[PDB]
Amino acid sequence: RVGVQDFVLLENFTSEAAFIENLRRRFRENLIYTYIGPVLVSVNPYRDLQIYSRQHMERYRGVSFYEVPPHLFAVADTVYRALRTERRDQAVMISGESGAGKTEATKRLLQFYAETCPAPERGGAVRDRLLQSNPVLEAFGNAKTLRNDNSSRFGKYMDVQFDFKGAPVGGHILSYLLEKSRVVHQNHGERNFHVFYQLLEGGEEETLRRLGLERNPQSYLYLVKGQCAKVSSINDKSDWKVMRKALSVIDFTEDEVEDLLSIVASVLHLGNIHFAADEDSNAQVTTENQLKYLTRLLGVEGTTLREALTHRKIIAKGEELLSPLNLEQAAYARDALAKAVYSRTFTWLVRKINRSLASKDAESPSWRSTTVLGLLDIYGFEVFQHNSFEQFCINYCNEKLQQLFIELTLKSEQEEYEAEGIAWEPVQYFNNKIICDLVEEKFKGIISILDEECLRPGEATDLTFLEKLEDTVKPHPHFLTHKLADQKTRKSLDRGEFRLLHYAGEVTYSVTGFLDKNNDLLFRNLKETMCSSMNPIMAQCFDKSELSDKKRPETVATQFKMSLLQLVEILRSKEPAYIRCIKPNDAKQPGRFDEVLIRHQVKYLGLMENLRVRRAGFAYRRKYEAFLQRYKSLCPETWPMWAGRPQDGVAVLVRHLGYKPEEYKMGRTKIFIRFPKTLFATEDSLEVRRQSLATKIQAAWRGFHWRQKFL
């Protein structure tokens, strides 16, 4: 082998350079996978490595985590066989940067379950539906950024669902954290969701005529703000044909696809609506050419839409009151309808795929079994030279998925030692709860102060919001601004910005566009206008029962918080696993290794801190039966069978293997091994002992081989 396959082995473990050297050392020899104890680190090779063929899923099937070099198949077997024996739900969490290999990892987990599980026909159906739907979810949910061409701007959650017989019953697919602000407002050098550019470049002329769309993306106010309408690396004229096949393979009718494209076209037209002031400063729609097409494409009456874009409705003593919108609020109402229509249509595509994965079983006795092998493909810590509302929300997501990592993994491991009766001191850790509360706490957090400045009376602005962070979170140890900073720090941090000391280190946020991006003023007038729609998809996105909600419209930060609280809750019930994914270049190519990028990956993924904690705790555990039945062949007193208690058989076996008192612990029902070195030494001893087992079988076969065909 090349460099140490498990970072808990390296001895200089407090040093960032020795870690990056072992990545650099292994990677350039095509060893793209390396562990941190049970956690996987996966480096994207940007080329075909044939390590995923059927023979590799066989090579890893049921093999123990220490016999073989790291791979997704080694994690997949581990999380599967946990589910298959503890019968309690699991969650494989994949995270890492845009272009780091999260969605290619997700594809190789599904190919692995389909080939390893008992039911290859239903495994094939759940694989194929979750893979063939991918070009659709990428077209509607990814977008171009300053860095990568195809950044996934949502968390995609996916299950394969298993019975107690260990066969795939069905699947699930869910989508938690769609970046709504991007539908309407991109930063410089970033483009809107791919479906728009794929529609305009790739569409048939008859379709674009039907939709009222011209080819040049700069003619649409929602496509042009990015200033990158044309890109050399992306072939929109060809991804469209794979996207349209993918809709057709999810069993969409051509009627559903024309209903769907009419919404993509409608979002383009919704951006082209221009308001101007009446004499009372009320908004009036100046044009008619957009509303002409929106009347057909959204299937809503043109005067009703013209009214809803320009008035907000309240309902009081049964009376209904239209109050007209100032043209700043009409711009927010137009844009809130674009974000609403797009979000609900993406949620509808996801739910449309999900309902085709469902169990075919009667959900009735003897039905008494559900177990889930959940996957999450979620972004890593997003950091740029210019960070906005988008990165603030994304980095708040990775703050909370770390707070959950502490709760589910670093606390449950201490409670495993105390339950198994091991007298061991807890590993010191830093706790995100102080930073989660800085962002989210009910009337103290940044999201609550940001929602206040969207709702507050008067000439509120991004800079007046920053002055209010400065006064409200004033004493806080993990928040800073240019005003609050000392002079040593004020050279590194400007007047348009604040800084959060996230668990993985500082990120610095420009306040510009925080109030424009947090506003999602979808008034009920726009909801009930859409509930009445003759487009079948909009009649399922907007529902007559929602009009009972008496509240003011929630902002995009609150909607992200409330859906992040649902992603945390959907994982909190399940036992985790982790893959951390590393982008070796900001511009693809194989073999090239950017250490200024990879040192930033290794920083913000928190790999050094996870290693410090994981090396201080124990590396391995098994129930004494599951330890003994494996390793007994090394110890003649336990071979072929041990007659005593399982714990007693392990007790003689660890004397036979010569473990010193610092290397192991005998817990209540689990053996523990502290250092991976002891376990590697034991697994290497078992690997030579297997030669004797084969020799005995071969000698026994050769003792039978003659007698059945002579005399």
Binding site: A316, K317, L321, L322, F443, S448, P457, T472, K550, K551
Partner: protein, 360 residues
């Protein structure tokens, strides 16, 4: 669940609901009826009224406290279906009220309803939240009080606050007086609730009172008819704009004050020379007595005659004028910087009901 309650105890209607709703859930009259149950409240009394109907609030002051406990009990228990012990309560008041009125609201919220924390806002301040502004002069006009509060960039000007004990109930009594000139008699407390609906449906503000008076004298063209609950038909003419004119000429009550337009201009003229420009461009209106057709047009015509020829005079009369105090409370009690403004029951134990003057 435990959002703030927002409760605009108006002189004519209770409006109540939760901080975060875009409109009140409960809207019902501040009426207790007793037969002529031992009593009825709100919509139950307004429909059973064949009852002696009494308002516990007159001119923004709670005159009867035992009927106000019944209205608060009906508000929380029957209308909002809510336990007050779970929710902090934002109440409202007119400016320049008695101090006993706040103190006894404060005591009854903590010692009868066991509210966790409470606050009393001035109603014309809340109306500036619902209109989205921190500079403007608010003309708020309800059932019992018409008052002006000038505010500049979030600072109120207590010396330039004006109050007039004339609003919608005094107009209802005046319409009920004028209608006797036609031979229509209304003298029962139930008949006063008939004449309030006549006022709300038939009346308007004349752009020029003497020209409409000449129009109704020379022609039947302004007349309209109303059908009584008894089935009779009542025909109304110059009474449609005689009634609301009493805001602009309050001498028809026999009051001595300046009009609603002069009281609004006199507030601007008590303000500092610099701020008057942003007040003239931001005359906000709220409360149901600002709901007449033509009133924002009359009010602009009148303030244009008082103010200098170069000033742009604007009047902000939203379609939801009638609920802007409650919508403003819904916004206020939702602000994260407001959650330190509440009087909490611990603070009400260390100092008695008089705490409300230090806190509000």
């Amino acid at each position: 669940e435990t959002t703030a309650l927002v409760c605009d105890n108006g002189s004519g209607l209770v409006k109540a609901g939760f901080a975060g709703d875009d409109a009140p859930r409960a809207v019902f009259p501040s009426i207790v009826g007793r037969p002529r149950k031992d009593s009825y409240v709100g919509d139950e009394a307004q429909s059973k009224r064949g009852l002696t109907l009494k308002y516990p609030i007159e001119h923004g002051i709670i005159t009867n406290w035992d009927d106000m406990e019944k209205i608060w009990h009906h508000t929380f228990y029957n209308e909002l279906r809510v336990a007050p012990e779970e929710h902090p309560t934002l109440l409202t008041e007119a400016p320049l009220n008695p101090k006993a009125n706040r103190e006894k609201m404060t005591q009854i919220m903590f010692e009868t309803f066991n509210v966790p924390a409470m606050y009393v806002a001035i109603q014309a301040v809340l109306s500036l939240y619902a209109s989205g502004r921190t500079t403007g002069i608010v003309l708020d006009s309800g059932d019992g009080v018409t008052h002006n509060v000038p505010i500049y960039e979030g600072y109120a000007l207590p010396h330039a606050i004006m109050r007039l004990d004339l609003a919608g109930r005094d107009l209802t009594d005046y319409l009920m007086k004028i209608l006797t000139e036609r031979g229509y008699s209304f003298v029962t407390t139930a008949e006063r609730e008939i004449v309030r609906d006549i006022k709300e449906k038939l009346c308007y503000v004349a752009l020029d009172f003497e020209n409409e008076m000449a129009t109704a004298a020379s022609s039947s063209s302004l007349e309209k008819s109303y059908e009584l609950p008894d089935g009779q038909v009542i025909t109304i003419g110059n009474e449609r704009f005689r009634c609301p004119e009493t805001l602009f000429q309050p001498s028809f009550i026999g009051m001595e004050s300046a009009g609603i337009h002069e009281t609004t201009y006199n507030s601007i003229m008590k303000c500092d020379i610099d701020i008057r420009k942003d007040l003239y461009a931001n005359n906000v209106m709220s409360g149901g007595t600002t709901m007449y057709p033509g009133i924002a047009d009359r009010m602009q015509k009148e303030i244009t005659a008082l103010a200098p020829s170069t000033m742009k005079i604007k009047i902000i009369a939203p379609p939801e004028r009638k609920y802007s105090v409650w919508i403003g409370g819904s916004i206020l009690a939702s602000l994260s910087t407001f959650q330190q403004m509440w009087i909490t029951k611990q603070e009400y134990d260390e100092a008695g009901p008089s705490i409300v003057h230090r806190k509000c």
